[PDB]
Amino acid sequence: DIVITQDELSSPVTSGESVSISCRSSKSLLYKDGKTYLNWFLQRPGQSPQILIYLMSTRASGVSDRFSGSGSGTDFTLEISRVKAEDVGVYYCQQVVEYPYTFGGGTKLEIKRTVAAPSVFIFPPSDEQLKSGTASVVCLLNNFYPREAKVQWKVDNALQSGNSQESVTEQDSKDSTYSLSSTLTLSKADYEKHKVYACEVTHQGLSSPVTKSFNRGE
Amino acid sequence: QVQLQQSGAELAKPGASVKLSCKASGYTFTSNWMHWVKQRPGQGLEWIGYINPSSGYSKYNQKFKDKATLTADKSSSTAYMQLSSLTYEDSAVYFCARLSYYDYDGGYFFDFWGQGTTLTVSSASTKGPSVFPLAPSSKSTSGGTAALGCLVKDYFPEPVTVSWNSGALTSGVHTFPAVLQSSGLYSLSSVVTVPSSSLGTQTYICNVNHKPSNTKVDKRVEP
């Protein structure tokens, strides 16, 4: 079988800059007819792969003229001339010169953009959840850049530890931001023993930490 | 509209079998070979095989020759993949993809893909989610916009899907990656931002599916 190798990461790029993604095969993909049987796909977050290039350098249907391909028998390059927001995702090369078809491990592309502060939003637990004996408090950081952020929970001004979990979206394909959820989980008993619930966020887009809070039952 | 549509996510026990479907519409099913691809995190993509739906003959990656069995039903325009003697290594997203060929340049490639099917192989029992509102309030407004959402708690296995207003609301939606809780169950939130002006007259419902447990729920989210 042919082994196809790519780099895991591409050095992030700013909108309008060029980028170059490489792929290599353990055997030549140049056939006797002079054509090279290498395809490029882009998989956007949550979606199926979509064809970009076939025969090493032909653009498929509806593929931006910013994409182009080249290479030898065994070394290949996908070139994005003027990168845009919607290019974000994982790029895969695939050889189809022989069965079995084989793919590279994929190259994630992230885009760099201007620093952007999170909008911070806080959500008390639902009465419905409380009835069942747990409280989940949710803090949302919407549409920020870069991805690094710190979210600390304070209950009646005590810093919380070990009772929260975070999750972050992949880079948005229109505005190149991230969003992040922080969920604090308490028993109904513990929730009802305290008053002030606060989410404190530190981020480079913020002069100083923003705190969003509520009082239980307000 | 040429499209491929795959069966929903499944849980199966070690040693059992599953049969995944791929319905083709918008073209003559028998005209295009149907391929299947496996995807796991940090394992890239692996090619499984293809079937010629006109002839019924299928061809495999040697690695999958004992795992996968491809069939096709011409009357229902549906391709099937059976996965046998399941193990934890079979937990993955599986795609179908159609092959096209262009006689004018000799090019061939996968032009249309299914949306994928998640398979989890585990001895643990399924559990459908509890769905709670993330209610819009003054604590979730900014400008003349408000955030609201649904908390989708305590399910197994992955995945859930979340739509808003049956797919009419897509702009501003962020459905977060699931997190594994200490309990061994998953949880996620889906959020959206809307006009604060709209909170009095516009209904917001999250439509939550958990195909592995064969469950669905709608949750109205009120201020």
Ligand SMILES: C=CC[N+]1([C@H]2C[C@H]3[C@@H]4CC[C@H]5C[C@H](O)[C@@H](N6CCOCC6)C[C@]5(C)[C@H]4CC[C@]3(C)[C@H]2OC(C)=O)CCCC1
């Ligand atoms: C090794 C030699 C084979 N090569 C090619 C040659 C390719 C064939 C060329 C002619 C095509 C006619 C047919 O109508 C096509 N349709 C059938 C219905 O479904 C949609 C597509 C597929 C078709 C049979 C191609 C399938 C893939 C074939 C075997 C390719 O081989 C592989 C491994 O993919 C590889 C390099 C170039 C020659």
